Every structure is written in C-alpha cells, then in structure tokens.
Amino acid sequence: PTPVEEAQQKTIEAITKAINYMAKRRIGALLTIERDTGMGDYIETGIPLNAKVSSELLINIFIPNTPLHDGAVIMKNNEIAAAACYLPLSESPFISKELGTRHRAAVGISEVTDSLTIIVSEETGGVSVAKNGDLHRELTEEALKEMLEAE
Amino acid sequence: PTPVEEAQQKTIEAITKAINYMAKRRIGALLTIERDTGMGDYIETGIPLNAKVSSELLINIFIPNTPLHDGAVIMKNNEIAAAACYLPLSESPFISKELGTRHRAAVGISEVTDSLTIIVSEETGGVSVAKNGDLHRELTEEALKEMLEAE
Numbered sequence: 001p002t003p004v005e006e007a008q009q010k011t012i013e014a015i016t017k018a019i020n021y022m023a024k025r026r027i028g029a030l031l032t033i034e035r036d037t038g039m040g041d042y043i044e045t046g047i048p049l050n051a052k053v054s055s056e057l058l059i060n061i062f063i064p065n066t067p068l069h070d071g072a073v074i075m076k077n078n079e080i081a082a083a084a085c086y087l088p089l090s091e092s093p094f095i096s097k098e099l100g101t102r103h104r105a106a107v108g109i110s111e112v113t114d115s116l117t118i119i120v121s122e123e124t125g126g127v128s129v130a131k132n133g134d135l136h137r138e139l140t141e142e143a144l145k146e147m148l149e150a151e
Numbered sequence: 152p153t154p155v156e157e158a159q160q161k162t163i164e165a166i167t168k169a170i171n172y173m174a175k176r177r178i179g180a181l182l183t184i185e186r187d188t189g190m191g192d193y194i195e196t197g198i199p200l201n202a203k204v205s206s207e208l209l210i211n212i213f214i215p216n217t218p219l220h221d222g223a224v225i226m227k228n229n230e231i232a233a234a235a236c237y238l239p240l241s242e243s244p245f246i247s248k249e250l251g252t253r254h255r256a257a258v259g260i261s262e263v264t265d266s267l268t269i270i271v272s273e274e275t276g277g278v279s280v281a282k283n284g285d286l287h288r289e290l291t292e293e294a295l296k297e298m299l300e301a302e
C-alpha cells in the first residue's frame with residue numbers, strides 16, 4: 001500500500017476502535033467526517049484541536065460530563081479539526097421518533113453536505129451513520145467499516 | 152505585544168484554567184512544558200496529539216479511568232505534543248515521602264532537562280512545580296501563573 005492508503009486505514013481503525021468502546025459503554029458520540037463539501041463554518045463553532053487521530057483521543061473527547069463531549073467532533077484531512085462543534089438540527093419527519101438531538105444533528109449536517117457522520121446512542125449504545133439525509137441505524141462493526149471504506 | 156507574546160499568553164491562560172479546574176476536583180495531572188532542552192525521546196513514548204492547546208483538551212486528557220490520563224502530557228510551545236508519556240523517576244530524597252509516581256516523574260524529567268512540570272495531586276488537589284531537580288509544593292493560583300509568565 002501507498003503512504004496515503006496506509007494512513008487512511010490507520011484512521012479507519014482508530015475510529016472503529018473508539019466507536020466500539022463507546023458503544024459498549026453507551027457513551028453518546030457524534031463524529032462528522034468532512035468530504036468534498038467544506039465545513040469550515042461548523043468547524044469554527046467548536047474548540048480547535050487540529051490533532052492527530054487516535055482511538056485514545058476520540059474516547060477522551062466524548063467522556064460524559066467533560067468540556068469537550070457536548071457537540072460534534074469534525075474530522076478533516078485525516079485530523080481532528082475541532083470538538084464540541086455545532087451541527088444543524090434536521091427537521092425531517094422521517095427520523096425514528098425515539099431518537100434525540102444527537103441523531104437529528106447528524107442527519108441535519110448530512111442534508112447540506114456530502115459528509116459522513118457516525119452517532120453512538122447514549123440510550124442503547126447503538127451505532128448509526130448519517131449520509132445524504134438518511135440515517136442508517138443499528139450497524140454492526142462490519143457494516144460501519146464497510147461504510148468508512150466505501151466513503 | 153507580538154503575535155508570539157500573545158500566543159504565549161493564551162497558552163498560559165489555558166494551562167492555568169485547566170490546572171485550577173483539576174486542582175478543585177482532585178484530578179491528578181502531570182504536565183511538562185518543554186523549554187530549550189528537547190524532549191523528543193519522551194514525547195515519542197506517548198500517544199501523538201500535536202494538538203492546539205485549550206483548557207478543555209487538557210482537562211479531558213486527565214479525566215480518571217480514560218485512555219490518556221496515565222502518564223505525562225508534554226507541551227511544545229503552543230501545542231500538546233503527546234499524552235500518556237513516560238518520564239524518568241527521580242530518586243531525590245527531597246521528594247515528600249507521601250507523594251506518588253506523578254511527582255517523582257516530574258522531578259525526574261526536571262533533573263535532565265530545563266523543562267517546567269506542573270503536578271496536581273489526586274490526594275489533596277495541591278499544585279506543585281518541578282524545575283531543575285527541585286519540587287515546589289502547595290502553590291497558589293497566583294504563584295503558578297507568575298512562575299509560568301517568568302518561564
């Protein structure tokens with residue numbers, strides 16, 4: 001593999017490891033990966049990090065009752081750009097009714113960007129992905145990895 | 152002031168805010184600020200972050216029972232270079248016998264570098280600084296800030 005390919009796989013592995021840890025403990029999480037549509041306006045609402053990705057840092061960001069856990073992490077160019085970012089809340093009437101603002105925020109950003117957002121539910125530990133205005137719920141580990149690799 | 156001086160002031164403000172927060176909550180912390188003696192060998196033992204400084208990130212790093220809380224954070228200028236770093240343990244007899252590994256690690260790195268290390272005790276919330284092989288304990292918020300500004 002090239003250097004770029006190895007870096008992308010390392011980042012996918014760090015993400016999946018962090019998501020698995022948080023799903024097991026039912027830690028709510030919101031992680032948006034910027035793609036072709038620029039998201040600087042939303043990145044600027046959070047706490048700047050421009051940090052290297054690691055499963056450890058992702059976990060430490062989302063610990064409940066900490067400064068950085070409320071809001072979205074936004075990743076860009078293989079780094080964590082910022083944490084505690086605002087995302088717009090979807091008004092879609094087709095989101096499962098039992099879901100709260102975390103999932104609505106993920107769907108909302110997915111309606112106006114080509115980004116991929118991962119959500120961990122604090123109620124169930126379920127893992128979902130928002131893209132193109134739709135929420136893909138109750139994902140297995142393999143399903144999330146396939147989505148990240150496809151993206 | 153110059154941009155360099157303003158950046159230094161912002162970093163000092165972020166450090167002091169985080170240390171004060173952690174001291175009040177008895178959150179143990181070990182934070183080494185690299186100076187003119189390079190500490191790459193110790194930075195490379197931890198988890199790379201290369202992240203912009205913020206009080207929020209510093210606090211999140213040291214939350215107990217998290218991946219990044221054990222070991223030292225090492226700062227380079229205005230960045231958090233790495234977390235969970237190893238530091239050498241001092242054998243100095245002038246370390247209070249009741250103090251644990253964080254304080255001995257801080258004095259240890261201060262014996263082989265010109266760095267300044269801040270320690271928060273998880274037992275008492277007391278704040279101490281290690282520099283040039285000496286540990287100065289029970290610092291007030293004002294004393295810590297003055298030491299950082301003088302550094």
Ligand SMILES: CCNC(=O)CSc1nnc(C(C)C)o1
Nearest residue numbers: 188189190191192193194263264
């Ligand atoms: C007393 C602590 N001193 C250090 O940690 C030096 S680190 C260091 N210096 N050069 C290198 C090469 C790998 C470029 O790495």
Ligand SMILES: [Mg+2]
Nearest residue numbers: 287288289290
């Ligand atoms: Mg005294």
